[PDB]
Structures are given as structure tokens and as C-alpha cells.
């Protein structure tokens, strides 16, 4: 139904993992057609052949920049159909480590955006604090990135003694690190002229384009899942919401920085309110027991045998749960048939929705701003291509 005829303009933007095809009438972009699937690992079908605990590490490598947030949505989706209550200390730990993960995602995102723009110092500077928080992760789960810490009904292990000391010590100077980070771009005319009024987005388009996370906040939209649909101990937490009204790359930059500030505030509040008590749900028929308990009791040994081979049987049903991810709203749709494996597990990624805005946003822009669009979109193809 369609011939080719006029070849004229032709472009190829990168096999190296985003492939981009654009259309210009010259120096100004008129069309932009991304092609994806170079990282589509078919995980959703792969999930069907794994137990709920077996498939948990799959969620580590969906957003390898922000991991515990990815774990949390799937865990909550399991638990809600399982009708399981999470202990207070576990909720505290989950919220605190989620804030740290959000800090890491914001740091890496802003540094990569800067390097794409042309600033290299903040990249290196912030990766030092990123290494600090990687050390924090390794201390608590033995893995730098793919912790697999979050568990159905709690977490794998309790926090080692002396961790909160170093957490507070890090927070005591993270504000200074952020301040020295800002002065390299905040008061710069070059950074603004590169970022100001590039990729303007409206509230109506954003809600039409399904935006989430900081991009939504920069359009004058009052929305945080942690305040509208709170989960775990986020309702108790008191913190502010940055708000911008231009939909600008500079605006999104400032919004992310203030989000980091609020994350630090929540980290402090969690640090000074850590409670003493159980960190795993007391239901041994879903939660694994202690090794000491397993080695001295027949019942816990039997439950360890069964759960670690067959696993708990989720009742048949369906649910969808989402989490206020640093890159937006990360949700997972769970379909239950009644067995020990999820029947159908659909994964919703905010970056995939944000990546769909390139063609309409890149219109009227320049090739120097496509990289700006991608960097400010804050997209990981691991979640985009599953």
C-alpha cells in the first residue's frame, strides 16, 4: 500500500544499545523513529518456568541502576495475593534502602546526563559516593548490585551491627557533596542554554503520554505514590515534594536534585526511628525459618525442604501493584492460577513509556538535543526491553 519513491534524506543514528532513525529537512528534526528490542531477553516467558523465589533475581536485572525498588513491587504483588503483613522493622529497612537506591539512580542519571552534555567532573565525583553506597549494599547482602535482599514477608537478613553508624556518617557529608556538585552546572549559563526550554512537555500531554516520576513533577503536577498511595512506612515519613512548571530539562534537573534532598531527609528520619523487633513475617509456611531453627526442629526442616524445592502456592487470582520508582512508576501485573509458579507476570516500565515521547518531543529540535532528550528521559533499556 506504500511505495518508497523519494529516498532523499537518510540517516542512521547508532547501532551502539539504542538504534535511532531520524528525519530532518536540514538542521532541524522533523521525525524520529527509535527501534528497540536489542535487549529484549524474553524474561516474561522465562518467568513462567521459575518459582516465585526462583524468578526474584530476574527483577534485579530489569533496572540494574535501581534494584530494590524493582524487587519491592513484585514482592508486594505476591504478598497482597498472599494476604501477608510485613513487620515494622522490615518496612523501615525497605524504605531506607529504597531511598538509598533512589539516591544512586538520581546520581548516576544526572552524571550521565552531564557527561552527554559535556561535564565530566560530576560523573567522577558522584561515583565515589556511589561506591560508598555499593559498599553499604555489599555489607548487607554480599552483592554490589544484584542483592536479592527483599523477600516475601520481609528481607533475607537483618542489618549487620555498625551499619547505621556509617550511614549517618555518609549522610553527614552527602549534602556537601551535592552542594559542590551543583556549583558546576547550577550557576552556569552554558548548562542552562543547553538545557533550558529543550523538550517542553505539558501536563495534558504527559498524562496522555503516561509520564511518571520526576518528569511528571516538573509540569506543575502534585503527585507522589508515596503520598497518594503509600506503601510500607512511607505514610509515616514527612518530606516535601519539589514542583516545577515549565517541563524543561533544567527543570527536571532541579527536580531530581530536590528529590535527592528529600531522599536524604527520609534517610535521616528512618535512621533516627529504627525499631527493634522481627524482620521477617512469622509465617513459616511462606517465609523460610532460621537455620538454627531448621537444624533443631522437624517442622522448620520440613518447611525449609518444601519451600526451597516447591515453594508456597499462591491462591488463584490477579493483582497489579506499582512502586514510585526513581525513573517513574514501576508496576508488575501478576496472574495466579493456584500453583507454585506465577501463571503470567507482565512488567510495566516507566522508561518504556517515556521513550515513546521522542518523536513528538524531538520535533523542532536539533541533533545536539537528541542526546539531551535521551539523557533527560532517564531510560534503562533493561526495563524497556524485557
Amino acid at each position: 500500500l506504500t511505495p518508497a519513491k523519494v529516498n532523499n534524506f537518510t540517516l542512521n543514528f547508532g547501532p551502539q544499545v539504542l538504534r535511532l532513525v531520524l528525519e530532518m529537512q536540514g538542521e532541524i528534526i522533523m521525525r524520529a523513529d527509535p527501534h528497540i528490542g536489542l535487549l529484549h531477553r524474553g524474561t516474561e516467558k522465562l518467568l513462567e518456568y521459575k518459582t516465585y523465589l526462583q524468578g526474584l533475581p530476574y527483577f534485579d536485572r530489569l533496572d540494574y541502576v535501581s534494584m530494590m525498588c524493582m524487587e519491592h513491587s513484585y514482592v508486594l504483588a505476591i504478598e497482597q495475593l498472599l494476604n501477608v503483613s510485613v513487620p515494622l522493622r522490615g518496612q523501615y529497612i525497605r524504605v531506607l534502602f529504597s531511598e538509598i537506591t533512589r539516591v544512586l539512580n538520581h546520581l548516576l542519571a544526572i552524571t550521565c546526563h552531564s557527561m552527554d552534555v559535556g561535564a565530566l567532573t560530576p560523573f567522577l565525583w558522584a561515583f565515589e559516593e556511589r561506591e560508598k553506597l555499593f559498599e553499604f549494599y555489599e555489607r548487607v547482602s554480599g552483592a554490589r548490585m544484584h542483592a536479592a535482599y527483599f523477600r516475601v514477608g520481609g528481607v533475607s537478613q537483618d542489618l549487620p551491627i555498625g551499619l547505621l553508624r556509617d550511614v549517618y556518617d555518609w549522610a553527614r557529608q552527602f549534602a556537601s557533596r551535592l552542594d559542590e556538585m551543583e556549583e558546576l552546572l547550577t550557576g552556569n549559563r552554558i548548562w542552562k542554554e543547553r538545557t533550558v526550554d529543550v523538550g517542553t512537555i505539558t501536563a495534558q500531554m504527559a498524562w496522555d503520554w503516561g509520564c511518571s516520576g520526576p518528569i511528571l513533577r516538573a509540569s506543575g503536577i502534585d503527585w507522589d505514590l508515596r503520598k497518594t498511595q503509600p506503601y510500607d512506612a512511607y505514610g509515616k515519613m514527612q518530606f516535601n515534594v519539589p514542583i516545577a512548571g515549565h517541563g524543561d530539562c533544567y527543570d527536571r534537573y532541579l527536580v531530581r536534585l530536590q528529590e535527592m534532598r528529600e531522599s536524604l531527609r527520609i534517610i535521616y528520619q528512618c535512621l533516627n526511628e529504627m525499631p527493634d523487633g522481627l524482620y521477617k513475617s512469622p509465617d513459616g509456611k511462606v517465609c523460610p525459618p532460621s537455620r538454627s531453627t531448621m537444624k533443631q526442629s522437624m517442622e522448620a526442616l520440613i518447611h525449609h525442604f518444601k519451600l526451597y524445592t516447591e515453594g508456597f502456592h499462591v491462591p488463584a487470582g490477579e493483582t497489579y501493584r506499582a512502586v514510585e520508582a526513581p525513573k517513574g512508576e514501576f508496576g508488575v501485573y501478576l496472574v495466579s492460577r493456584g500453583g507454585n509458579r506465577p501463571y503470567r507476570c507482565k512488567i510495566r516500565s516507566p522508561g518504556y513509556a517515556h521513550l515513546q515521547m521522542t518523536d513528538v518531543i524531538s520535533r523542532g529540535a536539533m541533533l545536539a538535543d537528541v542526546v539531551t532528550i535521551i539523557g533527560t528521559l532517564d531510560v534503562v533499556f533493561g526495563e524497556i526491553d524485557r
Binding site: 528497540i36 528490542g37 529484549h40 524474553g42 516474561e44 516467558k45 518456568y49 518459582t51 508486594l76 497482597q80 505539558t202 501536563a203 495534558q204 500531554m205 498524562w207 496522555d208 503520554w209 503516561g210 506543575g220 503536577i221 502534585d222 503527585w223 503520598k227 497518594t228 498511595q229 503509600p230 506503601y231 514527612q238 516535601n240 515534594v241 524445592t309 516447591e310 515453594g311 502456592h313 499462591v314 491462591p315 488463584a316 487470582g317 490477579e318 493483582t319 497489579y320 501493584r321 506499582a322 512508576e329 508496576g331 501485573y333 496472574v335 492460577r337 493456584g338 500453583g339 507454585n340 501463571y343 503470567r344 507482565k346 510495566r348 518504556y352 513509556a353 515513546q356 513528538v360 526491553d385
Partner: protein, 216 residues
Amino acid sequence: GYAYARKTTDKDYIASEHMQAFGNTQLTDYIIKTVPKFVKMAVTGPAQSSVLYQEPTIYTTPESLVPLMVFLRDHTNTQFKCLLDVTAVDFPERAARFEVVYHLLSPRWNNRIRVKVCVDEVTAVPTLCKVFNTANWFERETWDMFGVFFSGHPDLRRILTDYGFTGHPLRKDFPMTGYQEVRYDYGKKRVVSEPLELTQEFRYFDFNSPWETLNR
């Protein structure tokens, strides 16, 4: 556009009492009474938005899906301005093996909803691009993964599989590892797909006890 920042102070509250009570107890009944033709089956589920409430789920024919979505986005009481995603589920036991899924978010009233349409492999599903821009890529991915067609779409083509890939991997009958594997050949100097072969074949384990009652 909605959910604009109005209050300069911190909010200790979520929504209003009357609106929340309606949306959590009589929302489904309101939907049923309003457009019963658009209603075919009703399930109020585990409340995607929050663990402590109830939320509905909609089943209908593909014929009236578009006006139903229009009303659900545009009704003064149902301002579902955010369509989260469109996906599908395979039910090989049924006459119609596909259950397409539609999810909505209402930041106006902190609510959510699920909409489902059950179809077979040879029935068209009118596209929701005219209602939501994001449906384009979701319809594309659903077609790529299951072959669910969407009539009237601007350009419906594969988005996630290989360029020359035929078949829909998320189908239940589709093999886990598939049929073809790809390797490079020095003689032809080209990277070529070849019949799938495994050094160690996959091991399937049957843990499902013959005593479990929850099996459905």
C-alpha cells in the same frame, strides 16, 4: 490535565471521605447502572492502588471498548486520565484463548481500574491510539508477543523480537528456548540462524504435590 499543585502546605490526607467511600464501595455499581450494555461481567479485585481497599475489573466485547474507554477517561466521576498499559493473557483451555488487559489511573481521585476483553486469534481489536497516545507501543508489543491484531492502527509492526523473527514467544504453546539459534560461520563470513541445539538440555522439575488443594 489535572493533579496540579494547589496547596502550598504538606498534605496529611488522601482524597475526600465521600469520594473515597463511593469509589471503594459503589463505584462498580455506578459503572453497572450507567452503561450496562458496556458491562458484561464485574469483578471487584485486590485494589491495585492500595492494599486496604477494593477496586473493580471490567469485561466486555471488543465492539464497545472504545466508547467505554472514552467514558472512563471523560466522565466527571471517572477521570481516568492515565492508561497504564495494555497487555494480554493466554487461556489455551478456552474457546477464546486471549484476555487483553487495560489498566487506568485516576489522579483526580487517587483510584485505578482494570478493563479486560476476551478474544480469539482471528478477531480484530479496535485501536485505542485515538484515546491514548501510549497505546501505540503497547499494542505493538502485544501483537509482537501474541499476534493480537488491532484494527485501524497507523503502523502495527513488531517491536521486540528479531527482525526476521516469525512467531509470538509469549504464547503458551511457544517453546521456552524456541526453534532457531544463531551463530557466526567463518566459511560464509556471515552470522546465520541454525536449528536449535543444546549442549545440556533443559531440566523440568515436577514439584507440584498430589495433595495441594489450591490448584486451579
